[PDB]
Amino acid sequence: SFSSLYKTFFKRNAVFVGTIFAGAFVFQTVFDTAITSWYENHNKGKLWKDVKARIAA
Amino acid sequence: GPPSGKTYMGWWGHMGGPKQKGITSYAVSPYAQKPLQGIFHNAVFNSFRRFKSQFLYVLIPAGIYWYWWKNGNEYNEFLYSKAGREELERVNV
Amino acid sequence: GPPSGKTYMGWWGHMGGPKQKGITSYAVSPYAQKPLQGIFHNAVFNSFRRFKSQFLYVLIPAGIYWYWWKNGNEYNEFLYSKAGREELERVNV
Amino acid sequence: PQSFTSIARIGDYILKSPVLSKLCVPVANQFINLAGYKKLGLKFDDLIAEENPIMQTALRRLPEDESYARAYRIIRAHQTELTHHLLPRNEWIKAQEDVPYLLPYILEAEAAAKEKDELDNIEVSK
Amino acid sequence: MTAAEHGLHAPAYAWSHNGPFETFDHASIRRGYQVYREVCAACHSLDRVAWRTLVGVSHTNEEVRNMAEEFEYDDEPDEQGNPKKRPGKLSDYIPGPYPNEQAARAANQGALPPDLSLIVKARHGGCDYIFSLLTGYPDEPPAGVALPPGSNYNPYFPGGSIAMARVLFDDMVEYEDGTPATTSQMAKDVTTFLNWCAEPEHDERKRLGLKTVIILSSLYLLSIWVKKFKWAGIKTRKFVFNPPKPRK
Amino acid sequence: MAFRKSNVYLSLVNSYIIDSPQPSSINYWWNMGSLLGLCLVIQIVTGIFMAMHYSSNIELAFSSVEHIMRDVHNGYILRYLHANGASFFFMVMFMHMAKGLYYGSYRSPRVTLWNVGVIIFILTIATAFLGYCCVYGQMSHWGATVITNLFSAIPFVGNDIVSWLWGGFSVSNPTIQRFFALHYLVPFIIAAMVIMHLMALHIHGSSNPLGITGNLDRIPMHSYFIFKDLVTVFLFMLILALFVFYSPNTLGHPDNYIPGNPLVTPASIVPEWYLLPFYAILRSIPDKLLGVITMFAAILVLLVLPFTDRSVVRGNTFKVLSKFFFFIFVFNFVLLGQIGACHVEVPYVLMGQIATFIYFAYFLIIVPVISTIENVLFYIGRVNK
Amino acid sequence: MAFRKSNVYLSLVNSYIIDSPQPSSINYWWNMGSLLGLCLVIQIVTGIFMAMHYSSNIELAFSSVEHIMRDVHNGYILRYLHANGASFFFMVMFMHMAKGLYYGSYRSPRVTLWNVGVIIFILTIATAFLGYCCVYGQMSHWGATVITNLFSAIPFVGNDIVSWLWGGFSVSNPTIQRFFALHYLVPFIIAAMVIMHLMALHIHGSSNPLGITGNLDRIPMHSYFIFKDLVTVFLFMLILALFVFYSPNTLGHPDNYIPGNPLVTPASIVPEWYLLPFYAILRSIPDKLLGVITMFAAILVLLVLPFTDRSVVRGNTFKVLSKFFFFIFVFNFVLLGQIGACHVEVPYVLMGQIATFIYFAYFLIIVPVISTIENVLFYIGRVNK
């Protein structure tokens, strides 16, 4: 964190609850997508989706 | 302990009432009194005397409601009898 | 409020300690201090306090117990191996 | 909860005996140095658990100047402890300064308390 | 306790699901089901696994529906009260080979083959143990070992005397995907399938674990910094003593 | 005055959590109590949510827990949190108790606080026993059998008490159903006992690492300790999450994944880890009645400490000998646990008997002797004559 | 000082039930509170002992209660006590609330005490509902269906809330098992709210029948009120025993002796007697949403009393018009209950609607209008110029 970067968004005030809650909602979405993508990529070839791609009946 | 908010009641020695003076009370030990034999004649006349002062406050409202109930109940019994079928069809729809 | 029993701790303004005089304390606002930009390196020589000064009180008893455990464990393993069959029958029965 | 009267009785017996003294004092000196209370700016008498009637009587009778000084040593020690450091060497309590300043007040209170208890339970032999 | 009574320690194999970031190999779960069906199912039940759970894990909805319908289950009696049967459905649980314990014991020389739904979690050693057991039957028991009639020797089993004989032999199964059905390949596959049967939440649990440890680690570090800031005034506090003038 | 002080309900909150004067020097060891409060909350909440999907009937119990593991959304998280949470509850409690022992927290004027603590310890052990029985795995049935049989040692009426506890001829349906009902109840009794614990604590306040008066320098609970407690709350959650999500069955026993069988006690039977030290103590006595009495005595002996500690100073911080022996006691307790995890064989039997002697000797001989000696050393080590 | 005062635990007992200064004139109406505490204890104890033999699974629930009635030693006593105890809990609570209404107990400085009481009333009704569902008879299934459906009236998310509460397509296994878990929990929440109720009562003490200050003449709780409360405790037990042993099913519904059937709602369906007045209020509104809103408002309207009572004196003892209308309100409540026990037919529909209007009018119109008139009457009836 850089002082001037923080000041451009909040000046010398702490972050208010309203903004904290709003940020938590955004965090939840972005964080989940990022983790899931990294996790599925790390296990590529082992997932059912990957197996179903080749295997069939 | 922390300072707590004052109320309208204290405790023994500082109950929160006005200063008392000029009043003298007297009492006698329960052990020195007649073995609770002064019940009848001294409480049978007072009993019902208290309720003679209160019964109308209870009885009138009770009477209004009991009669309102009985009237509706009797009307319902009539509406569902053979003789009330005509009026039942009228008031039901 | 009811009379409560005396203890060894009071509250702010009457904590129950001795009268304090001659001591002056000074402090500076956390906002005016360096943003904790000296955790490691500056607190590495002070670290290991609970180690250099306390490790022996922990280490010696720990060493005594660990070696006591290892010794007994090695013996048990010997007793139940083919080579330990004769001693097992001796110490067991 | 061993009384200071009992402690002193055993200790004095050791100090008065040339044999026991030369044998115990050195170990006691090492024990005290290892205890490390002097490095926090404290004297042994500052360490005595005070939440009892005898100690409260003792502390109440302790002269003002000494009481203020004891207060400072206690506060300073708490501050040093929370910072997880020892005081600068020059601020350490020196062996010569580690004096039993409260002990006499404690022994006096214990003697008075002991006498009251004996007097409260005296038997009369007619 | 002797080595025989304890059982031979099961070595650590390189299971592809070992590790905090690893999911099960689903191609292995799939082959494992086939080994279970063509070999294990003759003596072992899998009572805790509902057909529906295989969907999207090792098979398609269509494949599982066809598998379920190959078995018959009790249906509600007809209008006359007469009992009747019906083909299995996705909601049904995989059926066992025996109708009761007495029948199971009768077909296995008095021994009862345990349900395998939780076998991986119900044994010390987990996957390593199951695999080692299945591939650890020697042609003959060690010299001097008196083996009771109807029993078999397996060093990995406590006591060395087990009621189940070796059942995996090379090529006894023909894998749909063309994988060589060696005894070790089949043992590796059923064990993976059985691990999934015991812990179907495995893949999702580890994924949630990554999210949880990251958030908590950050919270922990953040809390330390916040704590230090709030305490900075007290921590750097300074005291000075000036002995008061004697008068009070 | 401020509303937080004026209001009838808020004043209690302010008194215990906001304005509570805390000794400025208490270290992180003083954070275990808040962690124990967190543990109780975790257990009660996860427990209640799981109770909604649990059946106590002996034929349905094990399967209902599997239903929670398999069918209930996030059910495995609830179960692993509850199971591992229980283990963490005991680890933190042992640390909380060890902290008290080290710093002489049990000494006057906090004897009542300590005694209430011992009661909470007993209730927590009983609660965990009842909960473990509810799973109805092999360890559940046999643990229920052995533990209830402990009372058969009571002369004359022992067997009757056991039959009463069982509700039959053995651990059966009535036993499991009553154990679940009781498992639900005790946590609330513990909560009530914690309130009593906090009340005893509040009148004298916390002790500190120096063992001396904290009255000369206090700081408010709010902010300082509220934020300091947060550090360990997060560390606790982090560590618990590592077990819950990455190694959920490490602290448990594989045998409990096998349904209870009244006809077979597995050779691999072992009590839950937090009970191992007491288990070893019982096994060390070659007699039914004395083994039982001795084990219960291992908990009750905690009550003699305020009387056997003859020291004139509170705590071990400035005591060389006391610090050494405290750690001897700690590692001896761990050894007892390790012995409990072993079979009844040479030389573990003698080791257990010696460790058992050391456990009791600590409270009854070592503490009083060493403390008396230290009192004298402090005296002769400075005084002239 | 005396040990009962110095000890941390006994000092609470002493302040609340031994030395507590009571107004010398409080009459027998002030005994209902202790009776409510007794009821709560009776319910929790009989409930825990029955829980030991109960199975919540929808297929086993009804039969497990029959098992309690038939196989459990004294089981029928436990069950009849718990069931008749619940009815008594409500009758006494109604009397406790009515006393408060009559004597102006809801007035300042006791508004907080009153509000906590309203919360307790809501929790108690909810608890009784959950317990009734546990029997899983015909009334249980349909009461569970209707009451959970009350939430379907919430716009947009209503149906989702109901499906969530059910844990399925309809009232089924998931529902009964969670209802039992919750039935076990709420009584403990009620106990905690009772503690909060008592704390609020303690700071101002009880009011009295004269409505004036009790500070000039107090007498200790101990002996006087301890023994006066005992009189009603025995009367309460006597009457409860008459029902439990001689007429145990009089207060219940025969349909609850019929196992729940998801396909048939009996024509004879009727809510538990203590819920009838509220049931009548809901039925009085020919709209789904407004009916549900109005019914909950019937409980919440109790909260407006400290504000609508404009009188300068506390209580009805010396108020002619207020006394009359208080009894109009009481019998109107009984009538509402009678209407609830009747079919939706002429002329009961209109009667119920009028009685519903009267119920609300009392708090919103009658009390403020009458209290204002009375203030003026007291003024012009003595002052002159």
Ligand SMILES: CCCCCCCCCCC(=O)OC[C@H](COP(=O)(O)OC[C@H](O)COP(=O)(O)OC[C@@H](COC(=O)CC)OC(=O)CCC)OC(=O)CCCCCCCC
């Ligand atoms: C599995 C169930 C438990 C899981 C939850 C447990 C969490 C807490 C248990 C540990 C505990 O209570 O240890 C207390 C011991 C005393 O410490 P002290 O008061 O003298 O500290 C002065 C500090 O530098 C102030 O420093 P400060 O406040 O500025 O930051 C301290 C540190 C705190 O870290 C913690 O989370 C507490 C351990 O933050 C850091 O900088 C660490 C960077 C990663 O801290 C230690 O030095 C640890 C000694 C090791 C013994 C552990 C034995 C456990 C079997």
Ligand SMILES: CCCCCCCCCCC(=O)OC[C@H](COP(=O)(O)OC[C@H](O)COP(=O)(O)OC[C@@H](COC(=O)CC)OC(=O)CCC)OC(=O)CCCCCCCC
């Ligand atoms: C119902 C199912 C739930 C069961 C719970 C039952 C609990 C009792 C509820 C009744 C209640 O609270 O009534 C209070 C009302 C007010 O009375 P008060 O304070 O003005 O009394 C002065 C007394 O003479 C002092 O007199 P004393 O103390 O000397 O004895 C009083 C009397 C008390 O009896 C009771 O226990 C209450 C009925 O004992 C007797 O003499 C009875 C001889 C067999 O008592 C009365 O005076 C009755 C007035 C009519 C109320 C009818 C109840 C409506 C249902």
Ligand SMILES: CCCCCCCCCCCCCCCCCC(=O)OC[C@H](COP(=O)(O)OCCN)OC(=O)CCCCCCCCCCCCC
């Ligand atoms: C029924 C009877 C119950 C009894 C249970 C006994 C407890 C069982 C073990 C509990 C685990 C944790 C042990 C707790 C011991 C720490 C207690 C404590 O308060 O220690 C304080 C001490 C140093 O503090 P100081 O204030 O003296 O430091 C000098 C500052 N000037 O801190 C230190 O010296 C460093 C602490 C090092 C801890 C070593 C613990 C080893 C435990 C092994 C874990 C178990 C593995 C299976």
Ligand code: HEM
């Ligand atoms: C590849 C398919 C199979 C697998 C994965 C498998 C796995 C297992 C496992 C893990 C055990 C438990 C051993 C223990 O208690 O530690 C076991 C036991 C047993 N199995 Fe199998 N099995 C298979 C096939 C069979 C077959 C086909 C039969 C019947 C002919 C059989 C009969 C038994 C019996 C009787 C036992 C009891 C052993 C004892 O307790 O002594 N198994 N099996």
Ligand code: HEM
């Ligand atoms: C659910 C269980 C428990 C809870 C919630 C609990 C909670 C607390 C809390 C919040 C504190 C203050 C902070 C601290 O010192 O950690 C405390 C202090 C204390 N507790 Fe506990 N405790 C529990 C069990 C125990 C047990 C089992 C014992 C002892 C057998 C015990 C003994 C003490 C003592 C003596 C103190 C004072 C420590 C001091 O200030 O020096 N507690 N406890």
Ligand code: HEM
């Ligand atoms: C101090 C609180 C508690 C402790 C120490 C505790 C401890 C335990 C333990 C050790 C188990 C066995 C876990 C396992 O190995 O699977 C258990 C199970 C269980 N507990 Fe608790 N518990 C507590 C409170 C509660 C409460 C209040 C409920 C509410 C009913 C509850 C409900 C259950 C249920 C349903 C199970 C069975 C499922 C399972 O095995 O996890 N517990 N508990």
Ligand code: HEM
């Ligand atoms: C479990 C239920 C309850 C319990 C155990 C309880 C207990 C008590 C007790 C012991 C008293 C003092 C003695 C008395 O006046 O009877 C009291 C007073 C009072 N309670 Fe309750 N109560 C309960 C429910 C309620 C409810 C539902 C309300 C109101 C909606 C309420 C309103 C009041 C008020 C205003 C007083 C003061 C009476 C006065 O002194 O004038 N209580 N309660």
Ligand code: HEM
């Ligand atoms: C605030 C206290 C309570 C209230 C108002 C209450 C009310 C009720 C009611 C109305 C019933 C239905 C009785 C019937 O018609 O047969 C019931 C049943 C039941 N309650 Fe409670 N209860 C309370 C507390 C408890 C507690 C703490 C438990 C603990 C588990 C419990 C366990 C049961 C059980 C097992 C049943 C089923 C057996 C029966 O029907 O009597 N109750 N309760």
Ligand SMILES: CCCCCCCCCCCCCCC(=O)O[C@H](COC(=O)CCCCCCCCCCCC)COP(=O)(O)O
């Ligand atoms: C029963 C459980 C026992 C656990 C005890 C742990 C105690 C910690 C509770 C944290 C409360 C912090 C309140 C701070 C506050 O009100 O200050 C407010 C500021 O609050 C904030 O900025 C938000 C801090 C976010 C903390 C996150 C809460 C963690 C939730 C996890 C805890 C689970 C138990 C006033 O701040 P100001 O003094 O600068 O004006």
Ligand SMILES: CCCCCCCCCCCCCCC(=O)O[C@H](COC(=O)CCCCCCCCCCCC)COP(=O)(O)O
């Ligand atoms: C949950 C709360 C509900 C109950 C509220 C009612 C409170 C009544 C409690 C009665 C306690 C009486 C103790 C008297 C005492 O200590 O004085 C003792 C004397 O006690 C006696 O003589 C015994 C009287 C018999 C008590 C009957 C037990 C009541 C049955 C239980 C009913 C409740 C379930 C001191 O007497 P003294 O003043 O002459 O020296």
Ligand SMILES: CCCCCCCCCCCCCCCCCC(=O)O[C@H](COC(=O)CCCCCC)COP(=O)(O)OCCN
């Ligand atoms: C063991 C049981 C728990 C122990 C109880 C003590 C601990 C209580 C902790 C609870 C924290 C919650 C406090 C919130 C209430 C504070 C506001 C308040 O009391 O306002 C009250 C009114 O409250 C109500 O109407 C309902 C309160 C219900 C609370 C339900 C949780 C205003 O009261 P007030 O103090 O302003 O009185 C005027 C003095 N001139």
Ligand SMILES: CCCCCCCCCCCCCCCCCC(=O)O[C@H](COC(=O)CCCCCC)COP(=O)(O)OCCN
């Ligand atoms: C939901 C409920 C929440 C709990 C709210 C608290 C309500 C308190 C009601 C409890 C009444 C029972 C009190 C009996 C205990 C009084 C005697 C006492 O405190 O003696 C204590 C010692 O107590 C113990 O060791 C154990 C007490 C455990 C009590 C467990 C029920 C002596 O304490 P003392 O006042 O003499 O002070 C000691 C000198 N520093």
Ligand SMILES: C/C=C(C)/C=C/C=C/[C@H](OC)[C@@H](C)[C@@H](OC)[C@@H](C)CCc1oc2c(O)c(OC)cc(OC)c2c(=O)c1C
């Ligand atoms: C209705 C409620 C009831 C009856 C409550 C009873 C509570 C009793 C005690 O708690 C207070 C008790 C749990 C406590 O004794 C001090 C523990 C240390 C007991 C330790 C304990 O565990 C074992 C265990 O867990 C097992 O599992 C498979 C098996 C066991 O033998 C093989 C034992 C065992 O031999 C002992 C001593």
Ligand SMILES: C/C=C(C)/C=C/C=C/[C@H](OC)[C@@H](C)[C@@H](OC)[C@@H](C)CCc1oc2c(O)c(OC)cc(OC)c2c(=O)c1C
């Ligand atoms: C998980 C917990 C939950 C969802 C709790 C819900 C609690 C809701 C309310 O309590 C606060 C509620 C019980 C309370 O509403 C204020 C009562 C006055 C409702 C009264 C009530 O009873 C009925 C009843 O008993 C029946 O029996 C067979 C049948 C019923 O219709 C045919 C009713 C009915 O039509 C109403 C309005």
